[PDB]
Structures are given as structure tokens and as C-alpha cells.
Amino acid sequence: AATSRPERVWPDGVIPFVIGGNFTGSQRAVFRQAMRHWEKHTCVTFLERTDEDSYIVFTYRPCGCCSYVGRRGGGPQAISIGKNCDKFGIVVHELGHVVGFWHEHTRPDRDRHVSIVRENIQPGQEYNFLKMEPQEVESLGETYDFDSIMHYARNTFSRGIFLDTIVPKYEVNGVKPPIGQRTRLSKGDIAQARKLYKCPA
Ligand SMILES: CCCCC[C@@H](C(=O)NCNC(=O)c1ccc(-c2ccc(C(=O)N[C@@H](CC(=O)O)C(=O)O)c(OCC)c2)o1)[C@@H](CC)N(O)C=O
Ligand SMILES: [Zn+2]
Ligand SMILES: [Zn+2]
Q: Which CATH architecture fits 1-201?
């Protein structure tokens, strides 16, 4: 679910950052490592902000709303981290928003790849499962990525942990594809980010 908006792509892949107060040394290091993980596999670079007008701010607040998708422009933008969402893989996911990715399951073509089980969604959280409108996403010829760091788990926003809200529609390597990994960027995330940022081959 890569943004279609050219203005949201950070110029030259350069993303200035500020780490806010109220984070421990340990948390600050994880933010650095998550950024480095993005840097190792793509042409995106994260720089300590000096006088840039547009930059990200690691903002201490409860997990949830919101981390801005792509470059906002004309000022700072939040990447929001709290006590229950400060681990490496979660920060890598939220940095996925920063670089310009929406959630994978919101791709305009997602109904070919996953079923949404509406009856299992927590009432009031259904809006999180709406597709992006087709003018808002350009997938750059890349296949729907079940292994994406941007993909929801099977029971995200579910009424109960044993109730699925998202079910892949078909098998990959003779098994239903696992979804919701928060370990590392997938092959697909890297390939798609490289296309989005026009990285040298
Ligand atoms: C109502 C939508 C809820 C989305 C929550 C979601 C999320 O952040 N998803 C991705 N983002 C969005 O969908 C989305 C929509 C609008 C915005 C957004 C984000 C940040 C700002 C911002 O930087 N605000 C400033 C204050 C300000 O300048 O007004 C701040 O927080 O300091 C934003 O500002 C309005 C444009 C919008 O994000 C989060 C869940 C854990 N998640 O998945 C994280 O990985
Ligand atoms: Zn997210
Ligand atoms: Zn993708």
C-alpha cells in the first residue's frame, strides 16, 4: 500500500529525525536500530535534524493514533511510540508509515488476497479495515505481500484472540501464508521501497 502521492515521497530518500523526551537510552537505541534496518536494505537515509523544515519526531504517547504516512511537508510530523509498542519490529512498521506505506491489507486489490471477517471485528474498529481508495495507492507492480511488516496479524482488532479478522484466501508453498510478522522487513517491503525511492540497482 505505497502512497501514490509524489509529494509524500521524501526527497532523495533523506528523512531528518528528532527523538523526543521521555524515552530511555534503551528505547532511543532501538529507534536508531530500526532506522538502520531500513537504511541497510534501501537507499533511504535517516539524519539527525538540524534546520530542516520537514522531519519526523519520535513522540512518546500511548500506542495508537498516529504516525504520519510519507512526508507531510511544511513542518514536523509524529512517529508515535508508547510503552506497549516500542520494540524493534513495531518501530520498523511505524517507519514503514514514515517512508510512505499504508497498511498492506488496505491495498485496493486486497479482496483478491484476504477475506475480512467483519463479524469478528471489535465494534467501532471496522474503519481500520476499509480499503484505500484507488487514487491513493500505487503498488508499483508489486504483488500483495503477506509477509510485509505492514500486514496486520490474523486477529488484529478482533473480539477475541481465537477469532480471526483477516484470512488469506489461498496457499503459498502448500500452506496458508502467515501474516503479521514484526521481526524484519520482508523481501517485498524492500523491493517495493526501492521502487518507491528509485534506488540504484
Ligand atoms: C484514526 C487513524 C488511526 C491510525 C493509527 C495507526 C497509524 O498511525 N496508521 C498510520 N497513520 C494513519 O493512518 C494516519 C492518518 C492520519 C495520520 C496523522 C498522523 C500524524 C499526524 C501528526 O504528525 N500530528 C502532529 C500534530 C499536528 O501537527 O497537528 C503530532 O502528532 O504531533 C497527523 O496530523 C494531521 C495531518 C495525521 O496518520 C497506528 C495504530 C497503532 N499504527 O498502525 C501505527 O503503525
Ligand atoms: Zn501501522
Ligand atoms: Zn507491500
A: 3-Layer(aba) Sandwich (3.40)
